[model samples]
Target: LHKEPATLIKAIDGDTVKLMYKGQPMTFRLLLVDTPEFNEKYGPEASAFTKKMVENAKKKEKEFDKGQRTDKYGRGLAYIYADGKMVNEALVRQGLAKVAYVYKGNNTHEQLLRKAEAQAKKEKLNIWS
Candidate 1:
């Protein structure tokens, strides 16, 4: 997975963040994972968790593979890394998010996320419980 340097603008939601990739403002849709929104269960925590995890992640990075480029909203979809670790996987591992958006394109870290999702489920955390 090739990663590009990114600058943090703001964490919009649980799985969405506004970033500056190469000095251009862009919204990054967290690839292969979906967290609850403000109106749903555990929504606020998911958003806050993402904010906490990402705000502390100044060593920010992004991974965008082939095929799955911009999403329907024209947001740049990618796996965001924080301090060399995948935050997407961390969200799943903690039961804040679940594996999603599997179009079978550019899933460089799908396996790791799935593994984390399973562990969260087995441990009866968040949505899985």
Candidate 2:
């Protein structure tokens, strides 16, 4: 489960965001999801999709982090929640992201995220198209 509540400051892209963690600013890479880069195909769309998701979260007053945190880049790796809906899962459900970097032991949402990815592929949504 998530250990703290975070204030979302910016959505850098589909999978990355800047937020206030523990009273200080920090960056987080969404756990179990990977979106296209800003320079790649569908990249801008992915970023825009994430930006919208973040904006909606701010409007709804919800955001937080969960799971074993921090990646090699020092960015917090977490499943972000907005109004109780998981942002990471949302991306996969919408086909904006893929199931990625899944550590069998540390991933709390692995099964769910994987299911979402499968559905995305089945529907041929976003990147799957």
Candidate 3:
């Protein structure tokens, strides 16, 4: 929802991660992404990118976008930021994930995700191409 301190605990794939918030650990289903699922094409690769980002972000001031709620699976739904950059947008812009889960309206942060999706399209990225 907004910027707050966060720690990278581990990645569950391209669009999911576990983060340390204050003294609590929260597993978040990363918002704005529908990356390839595990065992599917580009799945492991997607996971690799997530893990890579985790390492890189750990070296910087990564923060959690404390915006969504638990998605019925006991997982927090939100975006993650590393050095002020949104991880949701990064994966989309890089073609590692597709923008998803947002309805036609009532979705905050949709604008930012849309632009990234278009760029990945124009770049003929993985999911796009």
Candidate 4:
């Protein structure tokens, strides 16, 4: 469920947000991320990172990845790839996101994402800032 590269909106908090892709508010659950709560530890940074990534994509006016429909969240599910890789994964890599929950996941990209978060913890990216 991609946006034909021309009608793509942006990524928000691991969600692929667009307007009525098929006549509905398109929001894909950010694959591999189980971010902390808005009040939880590192929550604000995670959300801010999400916003930054999505906004950047919108500015570039490019098509970001949207993984296959694996879950039944009612909304579309995707991995959100970009630049030949996954922007969502990148978030984890930078420790801006965390795998707080995995209601239904195959753990395909979980390792990499979690590793990033770990690295961030060691280096204290947003956690310390």
The CA lDDT of each predicted structure is 0.87, 0.78, 0.76, 0.57
**CA RMSD of each candidate after superposition:** 1.2, 2.4, 2.6, 4.5
- Please report the candidate that would top TM-score against the real structure: 1
Q: Give the higher-TM-score candidate: 3 or 4.
A: 3
Residue-wise C-alpha lDDT for candidate 1, range 1-129, written one tens digit per residue: 688887899999999999987788888899999999977997898899888887897688888877767888879998888888888998899899999987776787888899999999999999888
Judging by lDDT, tell me the better candidate of 1 and 2.
Answer: 1
Superposition error at 27 for model 2 (Å): 0.8
Output the lDDT of residue 84, model 3. Answer: 72
| TM-scores of all predicted structures | 0.93, 0.87, 0.84, 0.62
Candidate with top lDDT is 1
Stretches off by above 4 angstroms in model 3 are 59-68, 103-106
Tens digit of lDDT per residue, candidate 3, span 5-120?
A: 66777778898888776667878787768889978887898888877776676442343343446677877777777767787788889998999987433267788899989999
Clashing pairs in 2: none
| Deviation in Å, model 4, residue 41 alpha carbon | 5.0
**Residue 126 of candidate 3: its Cα lDDT?**
88
| Model 4 C-alpha lDDT per residue in residues 26-129, reported as the tens digit of each score | 76666667666567877676777666765556432223233445356665555554434566677777766666544443446667777777877788776434
List clash counts for every candidate, in order.
0, 0, 3, 4
- Regions of model 2 farther than 4 Å from truth: 58-67
Q: Which ten residues in a row have the lowest lDDT in candidate 2?
A: 58-67
